[PDB]
Paper text:
Most diderm phyla from the Terrabacteria group have recently been shown to lack well-characterised OM attachment systems, but instead have OmpM, which could represent an ancestral tethering system in bacteria. OmpM consists of an N-terminal periplasmic S-layer homology (SLH) domain connected via a linker region to a C-terminal OM β-barrel. Here we use single particle cryo-EM, X-ray crystallography, molecular dynamics simulations, bioinformatic analyses and functional assays to show that OmpM1 from V. parvula (VpOmpM1) is a general porin with similar structural and functional properties to E. coli OmpF, with an additional mobile periplasmic region that can bind V. parvula PG and take on different folds.
The residues that form the coiled-coil in the extended AlphaFold2 prediction instead form helical hairpins and extensive intra-protomer interactions rather than interact with the other chains in the asymmetric unit. The protomer fold of the stalk observed in the crystal structures aligns well with an alternative, compact conformation predicted by AlphaFold2. However, the trimerization interface in the compact stalk prediction is different: residues that are far away in the crystal structure (e.g., M75) interact in the predicted compact conformation. Notably, the soluble SLH domain did not bind to V. parvula or E. coli sacculi, unlike the full-length VpOmpM1. This suggests that the structure of the isolated SLH domain is different than in the full-length protein, as observed by cryo-EM. Therefore, we do not believe that the conformation observed in the crystal structure is the result of crystal packing.
Numbering used by the authors:
A (entry chain B), B (entry chain A): 23 to 105
C (entry chain C): 24 to 105
The structure:
């Protein structure tokens, strides 16, 4: 539940956002976010998910499915952000 | 407007925050932000505006007027941020 | 304003400095603690919130530092959902 606990590189959600960054759908994230094996806070993840949701129409159907699932997973932080 | 939708370089607000960065009033933003002509999210723009409203003592009369206009234009995200 | 500054003179800046050195605070921008630059209350609060998320790493006085930071940045932490 804690918004500044971590999401780890071995998790589905980390790998999802990292792959959406590979795709250019996630862009504009703080430099070094995907560097090495550093965790990402749920709050930072949610910002990346919110931006992907705004760039949603450019995703393939599989990526749209990833965004949909991420949006559920981070709904509490997304609501905090006004999304 | 979604808080993580994009503000484009043609918008008054984009150009104003870029000018405030050149002047030093907006500082401490992500590197990359004003290099070239890439979009900035409303949420990041709002963080830059909040910073300038904190730094508004540095501003000349015309810059203070710009900042006031910006705080209006991003009032929704500024309210989310607690500004 | 959550984006008003915290200076390097401040107890709070130095405490998060110390906790980052201790490894309790991580994942902050690279230029955060260098060049004697101020930190916004917003970025301070994010680091404090990681310190709370990791508070089981801290000893008694580091916990006391975390507790004091959590009070100091309570408004920003609330806005962040913490």
């Amino acid at each position: 539940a804690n918004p500044f606990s971590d999401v780890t590189p071995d998790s589905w959600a980390y790998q999802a956002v990292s792959q959406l960054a590979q795709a250019g759908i996630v862009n504009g994230y703080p430099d070094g976010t995907f560097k090495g094996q550093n965790n990402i806070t749920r709050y930072e993840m949610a910002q990346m998910v919110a931006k992907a949701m705004a760039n949603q129409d450019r995703a393939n159907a599989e990526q749209q499915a990833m965004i949909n699932r991420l949006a559920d997973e981070f709904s509490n932080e997304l609501n905090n952000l006004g999304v």
